[PDB]
Amino acid sequence: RIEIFPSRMAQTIMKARLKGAQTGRNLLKKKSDALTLRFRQILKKIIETKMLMGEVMREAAFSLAEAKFTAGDFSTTVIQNVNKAQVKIRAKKDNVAGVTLPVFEHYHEGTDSYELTGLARGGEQLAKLKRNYAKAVELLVELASLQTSFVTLDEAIKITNRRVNAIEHVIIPRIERTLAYIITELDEREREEFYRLKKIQEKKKILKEKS
Amino acid sequence: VCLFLNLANDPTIERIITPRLALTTAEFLAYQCEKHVLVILTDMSSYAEALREVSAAREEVPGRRGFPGYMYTDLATIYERAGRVEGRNGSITQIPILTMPNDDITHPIPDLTGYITEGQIYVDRQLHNRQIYPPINVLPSLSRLMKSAIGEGMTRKDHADVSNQLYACYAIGKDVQAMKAVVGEEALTSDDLLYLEFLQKFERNFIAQGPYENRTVYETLDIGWQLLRIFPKEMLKRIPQSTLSEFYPR
Amino acid sequence: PGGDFSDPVTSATLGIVQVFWGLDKKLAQRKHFPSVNWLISYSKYMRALDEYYDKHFTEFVPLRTKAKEILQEEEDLAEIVQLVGKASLAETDKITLEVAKLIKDDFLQQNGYTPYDRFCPFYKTVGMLSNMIAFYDMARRAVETTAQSDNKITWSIIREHMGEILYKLSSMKFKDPVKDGEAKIKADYAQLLEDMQNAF
Amino acid sequence: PGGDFSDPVTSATLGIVQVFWGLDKKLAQRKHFPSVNWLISYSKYMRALDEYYDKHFTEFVPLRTKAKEILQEEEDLAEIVQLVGKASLAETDKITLEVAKLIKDDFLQQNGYTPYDRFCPFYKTVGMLSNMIAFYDMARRAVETTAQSDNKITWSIIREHMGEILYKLSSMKFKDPVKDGEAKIKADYAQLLEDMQNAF
Amino acid sequence: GKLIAVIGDEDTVTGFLLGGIGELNKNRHPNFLVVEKDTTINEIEDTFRQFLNRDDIGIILINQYIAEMVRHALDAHQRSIPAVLEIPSKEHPYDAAKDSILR
């Protein structure tokens, strides 16, 4: 696949097109290394804090048992009395190499809907089961902040890895075999000019010999 | 100085006899009067259009790109009048300054002098538009006989390693200079920030020197050690510890 | 338009002449007049004019040294934005992309049929250049020494707050032949206006 | 020489002739015969023939105006797929690439040694082209009229439900000259399946 | 997305409602779903479709033992929001489901 006509000026044009494509690799490959290095270090933060929430949720589950030993059964009092949320999230923005990363930030508009739960039997095992689970949603939001950054990075590092390889396989070899066509077609004009000029000199000796 | 002018008015046949004149006087001062002569030939690109012009005056058919076929021989008659000889104390070295047309090295004027000379020095338009004098970039430049020139008795012992390290940190510092643009000033680490601060002082204190400042070869290496002292130890991997122990603490 | 530096008429000329004002076709396609591009053009009478420039217009030489740096710092950064985007750009770099764009529209652009830009005298040239680089030097001063501790504007609150002052820089190419005194003091008027803004 | 059409024999010929059947080598590296490259080929008897075409085949001139548009729409999107990918296209473009692939495989490809495609009379040419473009226009209304609101036809349900009908469209080339009147009926008998399936 | 959703289990949601993530707007839906022994696989799938289509839901908590049934429904969800997490049960410890995105 060739593009345009060889003129001695297109060769400088095609070398300028090749120069931008040569620096279109390394300037975009190192972006794909900057994204992958954060993508690999987020995965280590994924694996480490996922076995860390498993210990916290195990501790919160044993706290639950303790609360039920002390204080009746709350599997209908807690479920029925929900009206509004006490823990909410707001989506914040972050970036690595110009790739906007969605991230989550938690905040408490605290109006305690379980301000009086137990209060006659228990209520001391409660408000530390609440503390064992508000610390759990403190961590599960921080893990989900790494979850939604992980899932949008590889779908944005696949589109960068294709744009590198489309340069390396489709654009750079097309310019380079265009540039090879400019060289051999310009050499073919130089033999045509050599054959014409030598033929004039051969005819110039013919007229000189008779005259 | 034995300065030989040749302007654009005076004839083009005199451009051919001009470096033959200049090297004849530089073969009488060197190894006939036994002194070291530095020959500067400029412009060596303007020599070849004078060589092209008298060629067509002889009704000779032009070779590749109009330049004659015997140009590699004709450039050899004036480039190879150099070197030093056995029983004589003088020497002769050449700096043939030439301009490549349309910044193309594939052109026969910087190509036929690349087969025959011993390394190149590059004057680039990138550093010239940045107002850096002299605009010499040292990544594509090379001196093929610089291993022989420098040494212990010749300049001093650390020359082979401070130049190897200044070339390495400038190459790495040029790579991190683009990641400040495309990745981010905050994402780059503390060591890559140090290569950023090296390159800003390398191009302004080592390379840029002004048209009247004659730094000797000892003042050159002292400026080079000031730009290597901003780096800590164990990054200067091109310098062995036998010379790094003295010149680094100062 | 053609055979850029390898053409037997142009290649033989550049070995003789000292000044070459290279008119670009790409600036002419976008109707940037005059279309002299600043990268491949040169002049060689820069050492011969510093004796005249240290005597009559002594402000000029450190400005032309810096104005050529900003015009290439945009050029080396223009290839960055078209590949990866402007989103990850620094703040010492975004102050180049606004002042260099202010140079290309105020300083470099010039209308030859407009009755005041058909001939620009040299005090008007040194005048508006000394303000567009003092604006560059003061804005460089703000971001660098006050960085990472003080709450200094990262160019987003500056570009809307200077919208009257940036209008004064962009309207500076309008003074005429109907002033020289008024045109000189207006450059000093706009300079002391910027000195109050940087005192904030 | 070398298959290059920038040749002193070829370029001198193209200034004289009116019809140009440009044969492609890449269409011969795959077994696509005849190898006429539909992009670079042209004719200059167009205005000279439509006075013949509003007499005998009164519907064919609006057909080639769309069939040449579909084949160029494929080429403008084929450069997107090899760089960006097929998964990010719209639905009006995925119907364009598959109808054009049906044109290149059924209409354009023609086996010269088989007993049926060694000669194709012009009612068979206008006939099988009138159904592959009506199928392109019927699948346009399935995407454009029901555009965004409803859970609509998105062309993935087409290719699994029209698998018997697409097999009818890909087999129109098998009509020998043992039938002349029946081939015109089966061109409309395939159309009545195309008529009702868009309703269901 | 401003709400956290939980499908969880019977003992799981009553700990998380005590954390403060439950919210009932009576128009649309409740933002949780207690999954007991006698609820079908379809009812978990509808509420999974409810929380994915809801705008205020930003995080979807679910036990992995419950997520083992709707696994075919969450393997098709490949968006950034809402995040879906698998938390361990009282009985069932841990491992699968997000590393499908990375091997």
Curated annotation (Swiss-Prot), chain B:
Record-listed ATP binding positions: R144
Subcellular location: Apical cell membrane; Melanosome; Cytoplasm; Cytoplasmic vesicle, Clathrin-coated vesicle membrane
Tissue and organ distribution: Expressed in brain (at protein level). Expressed in all tissues tested, but highest in brain and in adrenal medulla.
Superkingdom, taxonomy of origin: Eukaryota
Coiled-coil portions: none
Family of this protein: Belongs to the ATPase alpha/beta chains family.
Subunit organization: V-ATPase is a heteromultimeric enzyme made up of two complexes: the ATP-hydrolytic V1 complex and the proton translocation V0 complex. The V1 complex consists of three catalytic AB heterodimers that form a heterohexamer, three peripheral stalks each consisting of EG heterodimers, one central rotor including subunits D and F, and the regulatory subunits C and H. The proton translocation complex V0 consists of the proton transport subunit a, a ring of proteolipid subunits c9c'', rotary subunit d, subunits e and f, and the accessory subunits ATP6AP1/Ac45 and ATP6AP2/PRR.
Biological role: Non-catalytic subunit of the V1 complex of vacuolar(H+)-ATPase (V-ATPase), a multisubunit enzyme composed of a peripheral complex (V1) that hydrolyzes ATP and a membrane integral complex (V0) that translocates protons. V-ATPase is responsible for acidifying and maintaining the pH of intracellular compartments and in some cell types, is targeted to the plasma membrane, where it is responsible for acidifying the extracellular environment.
Entry protein name: V-type proton ATPase subunit B, brain isoform
Curated annotation (Swiss-Prot), chains C, D:
Tissue: Expressed in brain (at protein level).
Compartments where located: Cytoplasm; Cytoplasm, Cytosol; Cytoplasmic vesicle, Secretory vesicle; Cytoplasmic vesicle, Clathrin-coated vesicle membrane
Superkingdom of origin organism: Eukaryota
Entry's family note: Belongs to the ATPase alpha/beta chains family.
Subunit structure as annotated in this protein's UniProt entry: V-ATPase is a heteromultimeric enzyme made up of two complexes: the ATP-hydrolytic V1 complex and the proton translocation V0 complex. The V1 complex consists of three catalytic AB heterodimers that form a heterohexamer, three peripheral stalks each consisting of EG heterodimers, one central rotor including subunits D and F, and the regulatory subunits C and H. The proton translocation complex V0 consists of the proton transport subunit a, a ring of proteolipid subunits c9c'', rotary subunit d, subunits e and f, and the accessory subunits ATP6AP1/Ac45 and ATP6AP2/PRR.
Function summary: Catalytic subunit of the V1 complex of vacuolar(H+)-ATPase (V-ATPase), a multisubunit enzyme composed of a peripheral complex (V1) that hydrolyzes ATP and a membrane integral complex (V0) that translocates protons. V-ATPase is responsible for acidifying and maintaining the pH of intracellular compartments and in some cell types, is targeted to the plasma membrane, where it is responsible for acidifying the extracellular environment.
Name of this chain's protein: V-type proton ATPase catalytic subunit A
Taxonomic source organism: Bos taurus (Bovine)
Underlying gene: ATP6V1A
From Swiss-Prot, chain E:
Keyword Acetylation appears in the UniProt entry: no
GO molecular function: proton-transporting ATPase activity, rotational mechanism
GO BP terms in the entry: pH reduction; proton transmembrane transport
Subcellular location(s) per record: Cytoplasmic vesicle, Secretory vesicle, Synaptic vesicle membrane; Cytoplasmic vesicle, Clathrin-coated vesicle membrane
GO CC terms in record: clathrin-coated vesicle membrane; membrane; synaptic vesicle membrane; vacuolar proton-transporting V-type ATPase, V1 domain
The keyword Membrane is assigned to this record: yes
Tissues where the protein occurs: Expressed in brain (at protein level).
InterPro entries for the chain: ATPase_V1-cplx_f_g_su (IPR008218), ATPase_V1-cplx_fsu_euk (IPR005772), ATPase_V1_fsu_sf (IPR036906)
Domain of life the protein comes from: Eukaryota
Keywords: Cytoplasmic vesicle, Hydrogen ion transport, Ion transport, Membrane, Synapse, Transport
Topology of the protein relative to the lipid bilayer: Peripheral membrane protein
Subunit (UniProt): V-ATPase is a heteromultimeric enzyme made up of two complexes: the ATP-hydrolytic V1 complex and the proton translocation V0 complex. The V1 complex consists of three catalytic AB heterodimers that form a heterohexamer, three peripheral stalks each consisting of EG heterodimers, one central rotor including subunits D and F, and the regulatory subunits C and H. The proton translocation complex V0 consists of the proton transport subunit a, a ring of proteolipid subunits c9c'', rotary subunit d, subunits e and f, and the accessory subunits ATP6AP1/Ac45 and ATP6AP2/PRR.
PANTHER family in the cross-refs: V-TYPE PROTON ATPASE SUBUNIT F, VACUOLAR ATP SYNTHASE SUBUNIT F
Family named by the database record: Belongs to the V-ATPase F subunit family.
Protein name: V-type proton ATPase subunit F
Native organism: Bos taurus (Bovine)
